[PDB]
Design a protein around this ligand. Structure first.
Ligand SMILES: CCCCCCCCCCC(=O)OC[C@H]1O[C@H](O[C@@H]2[C@H](O)[C@@H](O)[C@H](O)[C@@H](O[C@H]3O[C@H](CO[C@H]4O[C@H](CO[C@H]5O[C@H](CO)[C@@H](O)[C@H](O)[C@@H]5O[C@H]5O[C@H](CO)[C@@H](O)[C@H](O)[C@@H]5O)[C@@H](O)[C@H](O)[C@@H]4O)[C@@H](O)[C@H](O)[C@@H]3O)[C@@H]2OP(=O)(O)OC[C@@H](COC(=O)CCCCCCCC[C@H](C)CC)OC(=O)CCCCCCCCCC)[C@@H](O)[C@@H](O)[C@@H]1O
Ligand SMILES: CCCCCCCCCCCCCCCCCC(=O)OC[C@H](COP(=O)([O-])OCC(O)COP(=O)([O-])OC[C@@H](COC(=O)CCCCCCCCCCCCCCCCC)OC(=O)CCCCCCCCCCCCCCCCC)OC(=O)CCCCCCCCCCCCCCCCC
Ligand SMILES: CCCCCCCCCCCCCCCC(=O)OC[C@H]1O[C@H](O[C@@H]2[C@H](O)[C@@H](O)[C@H](O)[C@@H](O[C@H]3O[C@H](CO)[C@@H](O)[C@H](O)[C@@H]3O)[C@@H]2OP(=O)(O)OC[C@@H](COC(=O)CCCCCCCC[C@H](C)CCCCCCCCCCC)OC(=O)CCCCCCCCCC)[C@@H](O)[C@@H](O)[C@@H]1O
Ligand code: HAS
Ligand SMILES: CCCCCCCCCCCCCCCCCC(=O)OC[C@H](COP(=O)(O)OCCN)OC(=O)CCCCCCCCCCCCCCCCC
Ligand SMILES: CCCCCCCCCCCCCCCCCC(=O)OC[C@H](COP(=O)(O)OCCN)OC(=O)CCCCCCCCCCCCCCCCC
Ligand SMILES: CCCCCCCCCCCCCCCCCC(=O)OC[C@H](CO)OC(=O)CCCCCCCCCCCCCCCCC
Ligand code: HEC
Ligand code: HEC
Ligand SMILES: *C(=O)CCCCCCCCCCCCCCC
Ligand code: FES
Ligand code: CUA
Ligand SMILES: [Ca+2]
Ligand SMILES: [Mn+2]
Lengths: 331, 154, 54, 119, 153, 233, 63, 24, 143, 119
């Protein structure tokens, strides 16, 4: 919604725990949320007040102590009122649906002119990030940068059929992985390290999701948004790309898996770190020049902390976490 | 009851003849350490050193010694983070490749056998330019070519 | 129409060998089950002993 | 509502109010604060979390009232058991007085085939 | 033997060998060797342990020098009522009897941890000879097999 | 070839195996062991039979439907073998991965009965303790078990014997020579593929099966006959 | 009222006591034990209030 | 109700070392 | 049974409408949060659901058109209009529990996929349903 | 309440990840399919013939069958906990491919299916 909420402590109560949102469409969703809670609290207050009026006015002892008798007025029908009380909800939900369609169409659009495209791969149980596209204005060298690793992408493309002929799924092999993305610059999460996806400020970004096995979900609470990442997203007719117009402010933001995926589902965290535009150009130049260097070293090279801060890796020991300390620190 | 905090699967260790040293916290690990003594005569040390220091200090394997006997291991460049230094006797490193992807390094090695016994155990010291590891290691024969070697009356 | 004791599949008797599900016939299974459920209550009386299977 | 019709005996009203208030307090104390911790970024089906998430205090309040809500069934089980065999006997077809439906036109408990006569 | 393995061994006296460098194709050692295989209390199980498991072993009093490196030898006959304890669990280091499910800890000198057995599995002292073959350094220090009234302990 | 195979193997490892075995195959403390030095045989047995990836820790990982093609399995096995070798696969004289040729040392078209007779004694001494006579399975301690030997192909039998999966002991080629392993394979496949002459095998479990059969349904049908012939009054 | 106030007194002593203990323990397994004490405290609080809520307008006579 | 000759060794395993003689 | 038969045409018309709407919409409309194409599960599900309500509505109507004016379908019926026989009802039967046990054996056999368990469970199930359906007809013993 | 106990503080104090997953899966299944739907049909069975003025229900033995098959479904569903691996642990929704045999091979995952089927 375009209209801002009331703000202040009233706004803090109304948004009821939602983050402020680090994108323009997160601001829109948070606005809409606060206003629908103004509405919801009105409904809840008046109807709880009716249920209290029932306790304190419509009692039988109060009625008998003032001489009302045995029975009340045996009214059962009021055709106009039971029409109006039905028609008013309809015209309420129609307005709710109008604003819903506005906000949904702004959030869900795919015409935001992305400048950085990231290919995201989920698996049991961590994340892999890679830069598919970086348009020239911030790219390494200035020429529009494509990220595909052709040899490895070709190996994945050739895994689409079994040479021994076990090709049951519409002619394709059961272990086809040709839908997955392989880029040169990649960051791969491990049990020991949180994957930190570096992105620039004030830049339109595209995320391209998919999973290696089982459904996962890409929930950044600071975007106020999540989408499921599927294996073979096109066979499921699941729109695998989404776009944000910008991240408004820089910092480190946690992200979690928000669809049940098995044992270590609660340990599948990532960090989304957002840096200056020129700092991102430097980061991508460094990584493109010396591709053996790791993610932490590039982060240090542009003057940021080597490892995630909004979240930490878990102690893998199945019993050591018993007395509270379930996080392992890094240098 | 078997899916508990103590499970049978989570306890299991690598069904290999060598020992290991290093935890989730230690900067440099060693995996599958074993004194490989051939039945012909050649001997050496098999191991894999793995750098996982988060301060990004490289560790150079300076020296290796087995029951006080010095090891000859061909020249190795330092182990950067998430690199691995594989080592075996040359006869057994000729049976595998050296990957171009990632960061793996094969170095042959050899010992002058003082007379170790099959089945026994000996202490092995790895010394890096940063520090040291000590680990017990069993003396064992190398693996055979699978499915070619019948036994004979003699 | 149904096998009952494929002795050929079991091989001759050897004191060193054994099988997993090496049960007796059904009318004796109760005795084997008794042997399984009895705990290791054994008596050690100086130079003598009463085994648990007593 | 239908324990008298089912059994021919009433339940203890005081024990029922204890059951109600325990259930009510425990329930709202359990699941009201979960709206906040869910909005704040906790996903469902999470066995473990980090103390940096900011989730701890909400989970602690919720679990305390969860155990209260679990205690709520102790007076309920006792009320059912006791009243089933020692409860106040029903002497009227409709012990609440103003039964609308047809089940209050027959005895407490009904006979095998429900109705000794129909209105 | 590899570093977590089990072999069933029998007593082979030197006068019955007929293999290796001294093999003669006219020496007919078969029936005596079968006589060795078919003794009731003859079967032993020779276990090679991993190194990190071998250094967790708790020996029995008087039997600390019976092993040879990572090689341990235990009587294969169960101390309950005489079945072979032929099921070595390579990861748990339990030796399991299929008859009535007795479990013996191999890192605890063969002491039972489940089932109706009460006594620990006897341990054989072993070593290597000058030619590099494994031999029995001595006899068991206890009677073996199931218990009887006359057996002490 | 071998470097492209190692590239494919590394890429598959990075999105399926790296959470429990680490990026450098070192192991993760309570999630999985170190793969340094397991060989191509371990990866073949585990991936091809379907045992890997494990997806919950229990008493025992079970055989299930495979997640990777045989070619993908061999790619991953190449990549793992580069991290310190180990035992390898059994190839035949032409270079194909060996299969039906392992059905006894003297194989030539059909299984020879001398191989079955020696492999029967070898199996009854080294294997049947856990897998029961003729390999129907058995129960171990605390929820563990020795599987049924039907689903395994000959290569998988050989690599099981070499690698010692989970609580199974290792049998190197110095312990059981190549010919003894091939005779054990011959015995498994003879008994697994010869119908019993005396009719239905009842699972070949042993006396409990024939017990249940008779002492329920056999006496039930003759009780039914008695009720047909006699009076219920 | 009677036992109402009695319960409300007792339960407070239990509840506060659990609140003292859940700070001492503090993330171990015994934290759970502390919470159970606190819950029982709250239960007896509500029990007292429930008694009051019944004797404010009883729906039964002791006849 | 325990065998009186089945004790743990008081002395701990000392991590000993083996060898074999040889011609060279 | 007029009102019962007739009120099944509310949901029939509604579910048929939602079926055609959903079908055309999922094949023609495009939004950034889904891929265009006819969604076959919801299509088949809604049309078969309208089939279920059509089935009941049509059968009950085709019966209603030739049942007499019953006292329970009459606004001023006296209680003595249904006096007489009401019908036969089973007073007792052990065979429902038997059938549940047969289905339990079948389901556990399917779980473990033991073939003998599946065979025995199917045999038990046909037997117990047969004995249920022969309960009130078994002959008198002729001895 | 086991779930709420383990969520009381950050680390895993007595449950594992697997056991927590089994717990929420079976909590959801039991509460929806073995409490909810059968109590609906139980209240219906009792009061409905009393409300419309019938002596019996139409098909008495089918009613008995419904009760017993629901109990057997419950027993089947909960029998998964008696395995060493344990119950099903894919959430009461059983999303795919997480429910395929390739991704959830324990026998409890089959038991859950037949349980809900019987109910
Ligand atoms: C309450 C009261 C209980 C009561 O009295 O019960 C009746 C019992 O009475 C008789 O018990 C007495 C005695 O009390 C028992 O303790 C004893 O057990 C009996 O002898 C046997 O053990 C002796 C003791 O072994 C010692 O060593 C064992 C450990 O082994 C190692 O060390 C040994 C030597 O030290 C070596 O042998 C052995 O090889 C091994 O060493 C080698 O191996 C190592 C590896 O481990 C290496 O490291 C080493 O270097 C080395 O190489 C320990 O376990 C022991 O404790 C102990 O320390 C042995 O010395 C003997 O040789 C023999 O084996 C002994 O009897 P006796 O001597 O035979 O006869 C005397 C007299 C007895 O009356 C009878 O006849 C009895 C009953 C007759 C019939 C009854 C049944 C009736 C019939 C049936 C119903 C069916 C038809 O008979 C007579 O003339 C009298 C005849 C008239 C009688 C009238 C009727 C025995 O008959 C028992 O069977 C019987 O239950
Ligand atoms: C799948 C196949 C299911 C079975 C066949 C189809 C069922 C309907 C048949 C027609 C019908 O309605 O007859 C009623 C009718 C009863 O009439 P009636 O005796 O006058 O009853 C009047 C009383 O008032 C009756 O009052 P009552 O309550 O005392 O008696 C209840 C009785 C009769 O109930 C009724 O007549 C009214 C309700 C209709 C019957 C079905 C009710 C629902 C069944 C259970 C829930 C659904 C199960 C779905 C299973 C499939 C899942 C994919 O119910 C049944 O007999 C139904 C069968 C029980 C199935 C249990 C589930 C397994 O049947 C007969 O008289 C004919 C006798 C034979 C019928 C059953 C034959 C079963 C054979 C197959 C067994 C399954 C094994 C298949 C193996 C396949 C190869 C491996
Ligand atoms: C409703 C029922 C809900 C059941 C709860 C499920 C979760 C079970 C659970 O909480 O287990 C904890 C863990 O137990 C096992 O390890 C135990 C210790 O933790 C661990 O430090 C030790 O190292 C283990 O040591 C043994 O194991 C070694 C292998 O390492 C061997 O060297 C050797 O064996 C050694 O001794 C130790 O094992 P025990 O077998 O001795 O004790 C098991 C038992 C002991 O607790 C108690 O007495 C608490 C008393 C209260 C009971 C009531 O635990 C449990 O059941 C406790 C939890 C039950 C509470 C549920 C609510 C009550 C309702 C039910 C009536 C292990 O199986 C882990 O998987 C598991 O997570
Ligand atoms: C009708 C349907 C349902 C009911 C009713 C229900 C009741 C509860 N639920 Fe729930 N549930 C959760 C918590 C509760 C709690 C605390 C209660 C309470 O009603 C439970 C209390 C009720 C009892 C009936 C307890 C009886 C107590 C006993 C037997 C012990 C008493 C004795 C004591 C305390 C000792 C005495 C001590 C003294 C001092 C005297 C939570 C989280 O806190 C989740 C999400 C978990 C996650 O990780 O996503 C959840 C998940 C679900 C799901 C989704 C499952 C899934 O995601 O796979 C469903 C469908 C569902 C349904 C239902 N649930 N629930
Ligand atoms: C009724 C008689 C049924 C009978 O004879 O059973 C068939 C018999 C069973 O063989 P089977 O139990 O499968 O043995 C496998 C052991 N490894 O053998 C078979 O299964 C083969 C039966 C072939 C029948 C068709 C030819 C006539
Ligand atoms: C008509 C014929 C139906 C009856 C057949 C009974 C024989 C059971 C049988 O076939 O046993 C073998 C079977 C192997 O399974 P199968 O069905 O062949 O399928 C492949 C496995 N998924 O095995 C199984 O599936 C499991 C059979 C094991 C039964 C329990 C064994 C342990 C307990 C038995 C105690 C002794 C018997 C007590 C019975 C009498 C009591 C009065
Ligand atoms: C009815 C069926 C009865 C079958 C016979 C059971 C006899 C068990 C006696 C064990 C004596 C023993 O060997 O006792 C000695 C043994 C040492 O005692 C111990 O290990 C200490 C524990 C002994 C506890 C035994 C059970 C007590 C309750 C009966
Ligand atoms: C954690 C959920 C795992 C993942 C992901 C993979 N494996 Fe694994 N593996 C795991 C455990 C707990 C074990 C121990 C033995 C057991 O069965 O539980 C293993 C074992 C292996 C082995 C055998 C090692 C040996 O000692 O011989 C191999 C060869 C292996 N694992 C390979 C492997 C591969 C290639 C994987 C990705 C496809 C993979 N594993 C996933 C736990 C886990
Ligand atoms: C008990 C101590 C065992 C002995 C002795 C042998 N094996 Fe085994 N085997 C055992 C277990 C516990 C397992 C499961 C391992 C796993 O990770 O799943 C196995 C497995 C096999 C297999 C694989 C079968 C399959 O499902 O693909 C085979 C082919 C096999 N074992 C064969 C085998 C042979 C031939 C043996 C004697 C030389 C033998 N095993 C010994 C337990 C035990
Ligand atoms: C081992 O860890 C197996 C899984 C253990 C899960 C622990 C939680 C159990 C909760 C109670 C289950 C009741 C089952 C009733 C069976 C009839
Ligand atoms: S014979 Fe070994 S436990 Fe019984
Ligand atoms: Cu995930
Ligand atoms: Ca916790
Ligand atoms: Mn979802």
């Amino acid at each position: 919604c375009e209209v801002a909420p009331p703000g202040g402590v009233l706004g803090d109560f109304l948004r009821m725990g939602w983050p402020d949102g680090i994108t323009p469409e997160a601001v829109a969703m948070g606005n809409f949320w606060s206003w629908v809670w103004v509405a919801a609290w009105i409904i809840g207050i008046i109807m709880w007040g009716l249920f209290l009026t029932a306790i304190f006015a419509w009692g039988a002892k109060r009625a008998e102590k003032r001489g009302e008798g045995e029975f009340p007025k045996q009214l059962q029908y009021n055709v106009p009122l039971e029409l109006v009380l039905t028609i008013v909800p309809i015209i309420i939900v129609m307005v709710l649906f109008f604003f819903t369609v506005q906000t949904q169409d702004k959030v869900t659009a795919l015409d935001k002119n992305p400048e950085v495209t990231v290919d995201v791969t989920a698996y049991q149980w961590n994340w892999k990030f890679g830069y598919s596209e970086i348009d020239g204005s911030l790219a390494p060298g200035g020429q529009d940068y494509q990220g595909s690793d052709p040899e490895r992408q070709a190996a994945a493309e050739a895994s689409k059929k079994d040479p021994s002929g076990d090709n049951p799924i519409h002619g394709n092999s059961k272990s086809d992985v040709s839908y997955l993305e392989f880029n040169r610059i990649e960051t791969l999460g491990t049990t020991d390290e949180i994957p930190v996806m570096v992105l620039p400020v004030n830049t339109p970004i595209e995320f391209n999701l998919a999973s290696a096995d089982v459904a996962h979900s890409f929930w950044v609470p600071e975007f106020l948004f999540k989408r499921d990442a599927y294996a073979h997203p096109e066979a499921n007719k699941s729109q695998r790309v989404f776009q944000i117009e910008e991240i408004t402010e820089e910092g480190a933001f946690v992200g979690r898996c928000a669809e049940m995926c098995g044992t270590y589902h609660a340990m599948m965290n990532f960090e989304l770190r957002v840096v200056d535009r020129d700092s991102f150009a430097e980061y991508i130049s460094f990584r493109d020049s010396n591709p053996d260097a790791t993610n932490a070293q590039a982060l240090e090279h542009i003057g940021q902390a080597p490892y995630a801060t909004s979240t930490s890796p878990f102690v893998s020991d199945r019993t050591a976490t018993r007395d509270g300390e379930n996080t392992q620190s890094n240098a | 009851c078997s899916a508990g905090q103590i499970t049978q699967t989570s306890s299991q260790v690598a069904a290999v003849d060598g020992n290991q040293a290093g935890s989730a916290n230690d900067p440099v690990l060693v995996r599958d350490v074993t004194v490989h003594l051939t039945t012909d005569g050649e001997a050496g040390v098999k191991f894999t050193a793995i750098n996982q220091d988060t301060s990004h200090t490289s560790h150079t394997l300076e020296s290796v010694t087995v029951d006080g006997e010095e090891v000859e291991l061909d020249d190795a460049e330092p182990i950067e983070r998430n690199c691995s230094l594989v080592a075996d006797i040359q006869s057994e490193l000729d049976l595998i490749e050296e990957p171009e992807v990632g960061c793996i390094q094969h170095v042959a090695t050899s010992l002058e056998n003082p007379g170790f016994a099959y089945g026994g155990v000996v202490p092995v010291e790895f010394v890096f330019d940063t520090g040291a590891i000590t680990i017990d290691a069993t003396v064992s024969a190398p693996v055979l070519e699978s499915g070619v070697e019948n036994r004979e009356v003699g | 129409v149904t096998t009952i004791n494929a002795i050929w599949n079991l091989g001759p008797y050897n004191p060193s060998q054994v099988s997993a599900g090496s049960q007796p016939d059904v009318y004796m299974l109760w005795t084997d089950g008794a042997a399984r459920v009895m705990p290791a209550w054994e008596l050690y009386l100086g130079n003598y002993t009463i085994p648990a299977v007593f | 509502f239908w324990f008298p019709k089912m059994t021919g005996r009433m339940m203890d009203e005081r024990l029922g109010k204890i059951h109600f208030w325990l259930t009510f307090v425990g329930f709202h104390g359990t699941f009201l604060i979960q709206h906040w911790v869910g909005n704040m970024g906790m996903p469902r089906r999470y066995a473990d979390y980090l103390d940096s998430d900011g989730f701890t205090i909400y989970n602690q309040i919720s679990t305390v009232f969860s155990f209260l809500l679990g205690l709520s069934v102790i007076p309920f089980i006792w009320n059912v058991f006791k009243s089933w065999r020692y409860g106040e006997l029903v002497t009227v077809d409709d012990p609440w007085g103003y039964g609308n439906s047809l089940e209050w036109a027959t005895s407490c408990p009904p006979p095998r085939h429900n109705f000794a006569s129909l209105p | 033997l590899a570093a977590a393995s089990m072999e069933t061994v029998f007593p082979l006296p030197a006068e019955m060998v007929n293999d290796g460098a001294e093999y003669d194709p006219a020496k007919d050692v078969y029936e005596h060797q079968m006589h060795s295989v078919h003794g009731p209390r003859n079967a032993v199980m020779l276990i090679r342990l991993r190194t990190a498991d071998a250094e967790k072993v708790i020996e029995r009093e008087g039997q600390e020098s019976f092993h040879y490196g990572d090689y341990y030898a235990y009587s294969k006959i169960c101390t309950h009522i005489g079945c072979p304890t032929s099921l070595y669990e390579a990861q748990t280091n339990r030796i399991l009897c299929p008859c009535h499910q007795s479990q013996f800890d191999a890192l605890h000198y063969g002491k039972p941890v489940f089932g109706p057995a009460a006594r620990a599995l006897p341990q054989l002292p072993i070593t290597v000879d000058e030619e590099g073959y494994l031999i029995a350094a001595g006899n068991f220090i206890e009677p073996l097999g199931p218990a009887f009234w006359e057996r002490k302990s | 070839d071998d470097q492209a195979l190692i590239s494919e193997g590394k890429d598959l490892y990075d999105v399926a195996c790296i959470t429990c075995h680490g990026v450098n195959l070192q192991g993760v403390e309570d999630r999985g062991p170190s793969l340094v030095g397991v060989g191509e045989g371990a990866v073949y047995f585990q991936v091809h039979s379907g045992r890997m990836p494990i997806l919950r820790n229990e008493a025992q990982a079970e055989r299930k439907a495979p997640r990777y093609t045989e070619a993908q399995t061999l790619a991953i096995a190449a990549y793992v073998a580069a991290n310190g070798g180990g035992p390898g696969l059994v190839y035949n004289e032409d270079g194909t991965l060996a299969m039906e040729e392992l059905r006894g040392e003297n194989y030539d078209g059909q299984i020879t009965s001398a191989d079955v007779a020696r492999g029967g004694d070898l199996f009854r001494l080294n294997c049947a303790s856990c897998h029961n006579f003729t390999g129907r399975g058995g129960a171990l301690s605390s929820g563990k078990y020795a599987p049924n030997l039907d689903a395994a192909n000959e290569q998988e039998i050989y690599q099981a014997m070499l690698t010692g999966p989970q609580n199974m002991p290792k049998f190197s080629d110095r312990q059981l020579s190549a010919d003894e392993k091939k005779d054990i394979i011959a015995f498994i496949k003879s008994t697994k593929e010869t119908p019993s002459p005396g009719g239905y095998s009842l699972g070949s479990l042993g006396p409990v099966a024939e017990g249940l059969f008779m002492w329920v349904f056999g006496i039930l049908v003759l009780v039914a006959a008695a009720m047909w012939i006699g009076s219920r009054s | 009222m009677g036992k109402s106030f009695a319960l409300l007194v007792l339960g407070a002593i239990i509840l506060a006591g659990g609140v003292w203990y859940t700070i001492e323990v503090g993330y171990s397994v015994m934290a759970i034990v502390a919470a159970l004490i606190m819950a029982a405290g709250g239960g007896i609080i509500t029990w007292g209030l429930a008694v009051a809520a019944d004797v404010n307008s009883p729906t039964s006579h002791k006849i | 109700c325990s065998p009186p000759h089945q004790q743990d060794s008081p002395v701990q395993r000392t991590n000993e070392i083996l060898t074999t003689s040889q011609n060279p | 049974m007029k009102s019962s038969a007739k009120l099944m045409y509310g949901p029939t018309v509604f579910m048929a409408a939602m079926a055609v709407i959903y079908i055309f919409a999922t094949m023609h409309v495009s939004d950034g949060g889904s891929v265009k194409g006819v969604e076959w599960v919801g299509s088949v599900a809604l049309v078969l659901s309208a089939g279920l309500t059509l089935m009941l509505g049509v059968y009950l109507h085709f019966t209603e058109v030739r049942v007499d004016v019953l006292p329970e379908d009459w606004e001023e019926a006296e209680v003595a209009d249904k006096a007489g026989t009401l019908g036969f009802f089973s007073p007792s039967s052990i065979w429902p529990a038997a059938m549940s046990g047969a289905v339990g054996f079948l389901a556990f056999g399917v779980v473990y996929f033991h073939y003998w368990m599946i065979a025995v469970g199917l045999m038990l199930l046909i037997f117990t349903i047969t004995k249920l359906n022969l309960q009130y007809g078994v002959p008198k013993e002729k001895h | 309440l086991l779930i709420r106990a383990e969520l009381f503080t950050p680390g895993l104090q007595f449950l594992s990840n697997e056991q927590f997953n089994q717990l929420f899966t079976m909590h959801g299944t039991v509460m929806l399919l073995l409490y909810g739907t059968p109590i609906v049909w139980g209240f219906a069975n009792y009061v409905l013939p009393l409300q419309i003025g019938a002596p019996d229900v139409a098909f008495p033995r089918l009613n008995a069958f419904g009760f017993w098959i629901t109990t057997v479904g419950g027993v089947a569903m909960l029998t998964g906990f008696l395995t060493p691996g344990g119950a099903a642990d894919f959430g009461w929704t059983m999303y795919s491919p997480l429910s395929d045999a390739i991704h959830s091979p324990g026998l409890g995952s089959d038991m859950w299916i037949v349980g809900v089927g019987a109910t």
